[PDB]
Design a protein around this nucleic acid. Structure first.
Lengths: 42, 85, 130, 217
RNA sequence: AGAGUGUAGCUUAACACAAAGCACCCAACUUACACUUAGGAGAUUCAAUUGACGCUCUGA
């Protein structure tokens, strides 16, 4: 029931637009994150 | 500022849709919470019945069976990933 | 009146207190890079433990950590029976949305914060120490 | 009468992937996405995109679209793990990677002297040996692997008294963190069970209620 | 297979003009919780006091 609790409305009135980007550093395990399409760290 | 999209105008059929969605969501969440309540009650009563039977069977075991353990203190759980690594 | 049977009918503040293996104060830590998900699960864990009649000290927040900043939310949980705590932690691990960490490190004596007490609390404390 | 001293371990593995969404969830997800778009304030990307494009158009009369384009292309370039790994076998009970979105449990088929039925891993507990100790002994002996299991609580999750000399069985829950299993095709008839398989496998009425102390999730 | 039985979670609420009152969930405020506001879902197991469908304990 992970997806069940995943659904959430934004409570903060003052914020900038976020996009559901996918986080794939080196492990390959993707994560949906609301962020200002790929994530990389040296 | 708020000059990005000052205009926010939507139709009526979308409002009807929204209302239906919220009603369905309310029902769904009520049902889901009911499932949660059922399972936790079942687990709790299972714990209770097992413990009571243990009391009857052995007066020695329950003493250690209710005892706390230190190893629980630094517990970490790994969250589910959308893709396997 | 004292002599009358209706003595102490208006006693009120005996009912209020304006001041078995039990776990220490569990400071449950939830971290996710998405602020929304962390906040959601904080609210979820709060209302869950409220429904399960579990005492909560505080649900305060600490400043954001810069790395793609990670958002952290803590809830203080106390009043757990061992058998009940087992069920509690299995619940909170099961319904985890997306990759939010669960640090259940307990409160220590060295890491103690004293809250800013109100006037009645301080007056009560003075009366006791007198 | 002396009681047969038996302790059972129930091992659970957390789901690798999130459960599939319902139509209701996804349509409401789209709805909240719309709300998020509506109630945003001064997004930097939109300032960099739309207004800049307009200004450049006016200048040319006297770009961020392409940015999105090549972002999408390299996103498509990077291969993503298949959520449906289940489809390859569909018949293998001996695989850890049988299901990814569900909670799974070990079940061992053993041929007992008096009974022929599926039995959850057991240990014979001596008065000296604690229930916890015998749980680790169960994890070490009959598994023949490098399973690392976190023991939630010494409190019995379930108990059943079955008779043909009294017999008692106590079930405890353990959580799997990290483990490597060698020799999958061993002599031991080990089966990964999600939720439904245990009902069919455990024919006796006493054992049929295993589902009472295990979360469906 | 026998016994005990029976309203949504609870209530020896239901004489009636009636299936009621607390519980429960979503949305807004709240970092939260709580309060408040705005909405939603709910039942007399079936046939004539009786008989049989669901539940708990006793047989293998």
């Amino acid at each position: 029931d992970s997806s069940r609790a995943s659904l959430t409305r934004v409570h903060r009135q003052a914020y900038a637009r976020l996009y559901p980007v996918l986080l794939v550093k080196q492990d390959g395990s993707t994560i949906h994150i609301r962020y200002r399409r790929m994530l990389a760290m040296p | 500022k708020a000059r990005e999209r000052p205009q926010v105008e939507l139709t009526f059929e979308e409002t009807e849709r929204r209302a239906l969605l919220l009603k369905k969501w309310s029902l769904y969440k009520q049902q889901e919470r009911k499932m949660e309540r059922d399972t936790i009650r079942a687990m709790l009563e299972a714990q209770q019945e097992a413990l009571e039977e243990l009391q009857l069977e052995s007066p020695k075991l329950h003493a250690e069976a209710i005892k706390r353990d230190p190893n629980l203190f630094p517990f970490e759980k790994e969250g589910p990933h959308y893709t396997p690594p | 009146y004292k002599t009358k049977p209706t003595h102490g009918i208006g006693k009120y503040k005996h009912l209020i207190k304006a001041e078995d293996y039990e776990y220490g104060v569990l400071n449950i830590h939830l971290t996710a890079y998405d602020m929304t998900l962390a906040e959601s699960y904080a609210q979820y864990v709060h209302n869950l433990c409220n429904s399960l009649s579990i005492k909560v000290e505080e649900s305060y927040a600490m400043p954001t950590k810069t790395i793609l900043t990670t958002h952290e939310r803590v809830v203080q949980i106390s009043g757990l029976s061992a058998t009940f705590a087992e069920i509690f932690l299995e619940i909170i691990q099961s319904s985890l949305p997306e990759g939010v960490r669960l640090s259940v490190k307990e409160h220590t004596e060295e890491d103690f914060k004293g809250r800013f007490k109100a006037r009645p609390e301080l007056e009560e404390l003075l009366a006791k120490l007198k | 009468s002396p009681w047969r001293l038996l302790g059972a371990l129930c091992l659970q593995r957390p789901p690798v992937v999130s459960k599939p969404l319902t139509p209701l969830q996804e349509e409401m997800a789209s709805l909240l996405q719309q709300i998020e778009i509506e109630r945003s304030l001064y997004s930097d990307h939109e300032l960099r995109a739309l207004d800049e494009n307009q200004r450049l158009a006016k200048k040319k009369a006297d770009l961020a679209q392409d940015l999105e384009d090549m972002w999408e292309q390299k996103f498509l370039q990077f291969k993503l793990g298949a959520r449906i790994t289940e489809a390859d076998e569909k018949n293998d009970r001996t695989s850890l990677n049988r299901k990814l979105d569900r909670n799974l449990v070990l079940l061992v088929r053993e041929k007992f002297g008096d009974q022929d039925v599926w039995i959850l891993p057991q240990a014979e507990w001596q008065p000296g040996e604690t229930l916890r100790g015998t749980a680790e002994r169960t994890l070490a002996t009959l598994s023949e692997n490098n399973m690392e299991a976190k023991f939630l609580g010494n409190a019995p999750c379930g108990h059943y008294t079955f008779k043909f000399l009294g017999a008692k069985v106590f079930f405890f829950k353990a959580l799997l963190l990290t483990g490597d299993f060698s020799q999958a095709g061993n002599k031991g008839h080990h089966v990964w069970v999600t939720k439904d398989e245990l009902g069919d496998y455990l024919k006796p009425k006493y054992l049929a209620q295993v589902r009472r102390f295990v979360s469906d999730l």
